[PDB]
Structure formats: C-alpha cells, structure tokens
Amino acid sequence: QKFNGLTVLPPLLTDEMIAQYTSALLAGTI
Amino acid sequence: NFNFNGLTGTGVLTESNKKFLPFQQFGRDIADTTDAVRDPQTLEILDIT
Ligand SMILES: *[C@@H]1O[C@H](CO)[C@@H](O[C@@H]2O[C@H](CO)[C@@H](O)[C@H](O)[C@H]2NC(C)=O)[C@H](O)[C@H]1NC(C)=O
C-alpha cells in the first residue's frame, strides 16, 4: 500500500489461525 | 497526473481532516514523500495517495 512500489504481502498464516495452532500445541501437552 | 505548482505526480485527490499552518503548503510523512497538498486557489487540505 506504500507509494513507491513497495508492497507488503500479508502472511499466509493469519494471527488468528496461528493462535489456534498454539492452542492445539498446548492442548496436546497439557 | 496532478501538477500543484510544479509537482508532477500521480495519485488520488480527496479531502482530508488535516490542518496546515497558514504558510505551510506541503504535507510529508516519515518517508519524505508527498501525501498532503493545499489547493492554491480554494485553500483546502487534500490527501494524496
Ligand atoms: C482566487 O480567485 C477565486 C476566483 O473564483 C476565488 O474564489 C472565490 O472565493 C470567494 C471566497 O468567499 C467566493 O465567495 C467566490 O464564490 C469564489 N469564486 C467563485 C467563482 O466561486 C478565491 O477566493 C481566490 N483566492 C485567493 C487566495 O485569491
């Protein structure tokens, strides 16, 4: 969205779903 | 392809809530690029994107 060609591509794994992965990682070991 | 007193460049023009000083003409961001220009006839605050 920047002026001079510089674009930032959002990550494939969004902050919400990676939180789900974390909760999964906690859930198994707890 | 706006040209506000010699500034050739491309970008959308929309009214912005910014308020310049009476002498101030141009708006710049942290990256030192134009993002706010004042109309030289009907003095107003416009956003460049
Ligand atoms: C530059 O000239 C224009 C000529 O239009 C001025 O625009 C007028 O501004 C007054 C301000 O009250 C309005 O009442 C008029 O209706 C405007 N004109 C038209 C045709 O609508 C403008 O103010 C001038 N600016 C400077 C800095 O001199």
Side-chain angles (χ1 to χ4, degrees), chain A residues 2-30, chain B:
Chain A
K2 276 201 161 72
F3 264 61
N4 294 302
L6 277 296
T7 70
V8 172
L9 317 184
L12 181 64
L13 294 182
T14 70
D15 63 358
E16 198 277 331
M17 64 184 73
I18 62 170
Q20 199 73 42
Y21 291 166
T22 56
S23 180
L25 294 167
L26 282 71
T29 181
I30 62 170
Chain B
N1 316 85
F2 54 84
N3 176 32
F4 288 77
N5 282 74
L7 270 71
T8 308
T10 176
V12 307
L13 284 158
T14 185
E15 183 184 4
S16 179
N17 63 56
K18 300 185 179 107
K19 289 301 180 185
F20 283 3
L21 270 297
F23 62 93
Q24 278 172 335
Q25 296 297 109
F26 284 9
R28 282 188 175 93
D29 44 14
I30 62 170
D32 291 331
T33 187
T34 302
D35 62 357
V37 63
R38 182 214 294 277
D39 177 276
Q41 289 154 10
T42 175
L43 283 72
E44 276 282 358
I45 283 292
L46 287 86
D47 198 327
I48 287 284
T49 306

